[PDB]
Design an enzyme around this catalytic site. Structure first.
Site, short mmCIF file in Angstrom:
data_model
loop_
_atom_site.label_atom_id
_atom_site.label_comp_id
_atom_site.label_asym_id
_atom_site.label_seq_id
_atom_site.Cartn_x
_atom_site.Cartn_y
_atom_site.Cartn_z
N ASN A 522 42.94 39.53 46.87
CA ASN A 522 43.62 40.71 46.74
C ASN A 522 43.81 41.32 45.30
O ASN A 522 43.95 42.61 45.38
CB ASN A 522 45.19 40.39 47.35
N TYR A 523 43.58 40.70 44.22
CA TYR A 523 43.78 41.44 42.79
C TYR A 523 42.80 41.62 42.05
O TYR A 523 42.74 42.53 41.20
CB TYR A 523 44.82 40.69 42.24
N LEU A 524 41.76 40.75 41.65
CA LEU A 524 40.58 40.89 41.23
C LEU A 524 39.25 41.53 41.67
O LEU A 524 38.74 41.34 42.79
CB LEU A 524 40.09 39.33 40.84
#
Ligand SMILES: CC[C@@]1(O)C(=O)OCc2c1cc1n(c2=O)Cc2cc3ccccc3nc2-1
Length: 565
Positions: A522-524
DNA sequence: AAAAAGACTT
DNA sequence: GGAAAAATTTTT
DNA sequence: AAAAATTTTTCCAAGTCTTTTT
């Protein structure tokens, strides 16, 4: 083949698709009642449970093993929801849950799991095939000129609500989703899916401003559930890519915003000072923009904009630190956030102001919510909201730490360790905690005995080499020297193996109470990873597995070693 | 507005 | 997803 | 062969932010 959608021209704003066809949702398998030998008891004496009630009674039975079946709310909400699904010749008898004996029911189900894990490679092979004929006909939908996978085409079975944290609705019945709850969605020129015999779906929609194939309103929260496409799809991945490019745009004028929110702490209005301090919390302290939520309908949890006063205690000095703000609350998924943080002079002083003449149960930032904060962010940068920060701060930290960790020298397994250490840092910043693996951290003793065993296999090659030299000295020839080579190349193949075992034991023990998953996916920005891999020649499969490679198919192909976020 | 929904995202 | 199953694959 | 330690699926929500309704 593989359709390179990232090479296509961006889908014109608003419309999501021109054509959509799909076989529809798969319903949850019908209930098979209990046999003759599995009896239910109430007040000690046998009770015949009608199909409707018998089922609601199984859901509890199968959970008897859990400690939560003893919580007030769980049992209160449960019993109430069971009453409704009972006949009158049963609603008259069963006055309380406490007099009901599920012990036998609960025992049969623990036996089913045993008798299941003792099957034949005839039955086990047949099910694993009937399960594949379902994935073909139901798991692939057609969105514009292409065949793309569906994420969770199987509608969730009915059971009992548990949720996460201390939730008010735990124990309620999750009803069985019937076709009459389903709202199909597809194109006018597409073959509409046929409903289960003698039924009607709620609605056959044609809304092309959405990405969903099916929707229904579940009864616990009254929220809408969806059957959306697989992350590997175009529609999901262009969205993903956009989200990254938006946080990448935040990068070129992040310090600009940091200049402003700094001096905003010195403005005339409390409303602008609040907005700025909150923005600090979201930026430097990786907090979520905490929306307000209905109390008594969810677990009491927060985020920055919703932070009540009771979630902080102001301390001037502690451990040799100046101006420490002690954070203590339950974040998303009732996961605790405790942080002792040394802030600047105005910020600590601003917080005292925000907490004056207030009661613990009151908001920190009154005159603020996610709506005000996000309206500002939009003006500050075209298309910016308060979640983008987490995307920036997480992504950029990976890029930075991968630079500050990866050494050219290291063999492939230690670079994997360096990558994971990078991931780990992001994880702790984004507070993706973990409860230690079910007492199994004695797998470390069972990994250390494997390392200590390799220290022997190597220790023997060392004393083999020491004797090879003791024969190479007396009577030196091309038969003794070429053996001191074969005993040197032997110390090395074992040395590289011990490294591979020790580095893998570090990786495992550092990532003990951390979670890389939510950030990994989800974030990188996957390109950050892909570049790093192309550079040091680390074959991607060592970092991203197959569903991940597929989700991140766009990054892999459309990114070189030189890529910079 | 600003609540109450809906559709994505974590 | 993250812990629990379940299906594997490694150890003993 | 069978305990054991792994790899992989299966089970099951809670946020963020946009768009409607009221
Ligand atoms: C711990 C990780 C995390 O909470 C999270 O913060 O981000 C990723 C994520 C979570 C949960 C979830 N999903 C997720 O993608 C997809 C999903 C589907 C579900 C479907 C039914 C019930 C719970 C469900 N929870 C998640």
């Amino acid at each position: 083949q593989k359709w390179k959608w990232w090479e296509e021209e961006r889908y014109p704003e608003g419309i999501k698709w021109k054509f959509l066809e799909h076989k529809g949702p798969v319903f949850a398998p019908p209930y098979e009642p209990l046999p003759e030998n599995v009896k239910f008891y109430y007040d000690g004496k046998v009770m015949k449970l009608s199909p409707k009630a018998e089922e609601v009674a199984t859901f509890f039975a199968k959970m008897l093993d859990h400690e939560y079946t003893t919580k007030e709310i769980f049992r209160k909400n449960f019993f109430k929801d069971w009453r409704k699904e009972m006949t009158n010749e049963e609603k008259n008898i069963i006055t309380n849950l406490s007099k009901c004996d599920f012990t036998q029911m609960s025992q049969y189900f623990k036996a089913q799991t045993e008798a299941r894990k003792q099957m034949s490679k005839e039955e086990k092979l047949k099910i694993k095939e009937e399960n594949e004929k379902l994935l073909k006909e139901y798991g692939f939908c057609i969105m514009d000129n292409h065949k793309e996978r569906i994420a969770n085409f199987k509608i969730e079975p009915p059971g009992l609500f548990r949720g996460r944290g201390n939730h008010p609705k735990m124990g309620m019945l999750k009803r069985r989703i019937m076709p009459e709850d389903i709202i199909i969605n597809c194109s006018k020129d597409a073959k509409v899916p046929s409903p289960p015999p003698g039924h009607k779906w709620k609605e056959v929609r044609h809304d092309n401003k959405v990405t969903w194939l099916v929707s229904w309103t579940e009864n616990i929260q009254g929220s809408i559930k969806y059957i959306m496409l697989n992350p590997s799809s175009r529609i999901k991945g262009e969205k993903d890519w956009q989200k990254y490019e938006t946080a990448r745009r935040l990068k070129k004028c992040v310090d600009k915003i940091r200049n402003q929110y700094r001096e905003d702490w010195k403005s005339k209005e409390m409303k602008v000072r609040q907005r700025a301090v909150a923005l600090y919390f979201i930026d430097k302290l990786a907090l979520r923009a905490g929306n307000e939520k209905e109390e008594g309908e969810t677990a009491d949890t927060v985020g920055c904009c919703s932070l009540r006063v009771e979630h902080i205690n102001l301390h001037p000095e502690l451990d040799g630190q100046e101006y420490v703000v002690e954070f203590d609350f339950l974040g998303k998924d009732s996961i605790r956030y405790y942080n002792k943080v040394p802030v600047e002079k105005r910020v600590f002083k601003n917080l005292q102001l925000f907490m004056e003449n207030k009661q613990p149960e009151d908001d920190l930032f009154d005159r603020l919510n996610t709506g005000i904060l996000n309206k500002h962010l939009q003006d500050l940068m075209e298309g910016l909201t308060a979640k983008v920060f987490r995307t920036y701060n997480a992504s950029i930290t990976l890029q930075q730490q991968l630079k500050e960790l990866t050494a050219p020298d290291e063999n492939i397994p230690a670079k994997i360790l360096s990558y994971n250490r990078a991931n780990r840092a992001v994880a702790i910043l984004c507070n993706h905690q973990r409860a230690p693996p079910k007492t199994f951290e004695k797998s470390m003793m069972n990994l250390q005995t494997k390392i200590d065993a390799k220290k022997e296999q190597l220790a023997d090659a060392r004393r083999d080499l020491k004797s090879a030299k003791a024969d190479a000295k007396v009577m030196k020839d091309a038969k003794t020297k070429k053996v001191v080579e074969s005993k040197k190349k032997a110390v090395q193949r074992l040395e590289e193996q011990l490294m591979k075992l020790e580095v893998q034991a570090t990786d495992r023990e550092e990532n003990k109470q951390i979670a890389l998953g939510t950030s990994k996916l989800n974030y990188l920005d996957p390109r950050i990873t892909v570049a790093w891999c192309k550079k040091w020649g680390v074959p991607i499969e060592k970092i991203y597995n197959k569903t991940q490679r597929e989700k991140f198919a766009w990054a892999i192909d459309m990114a070189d070693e030189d890529y910079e976020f």
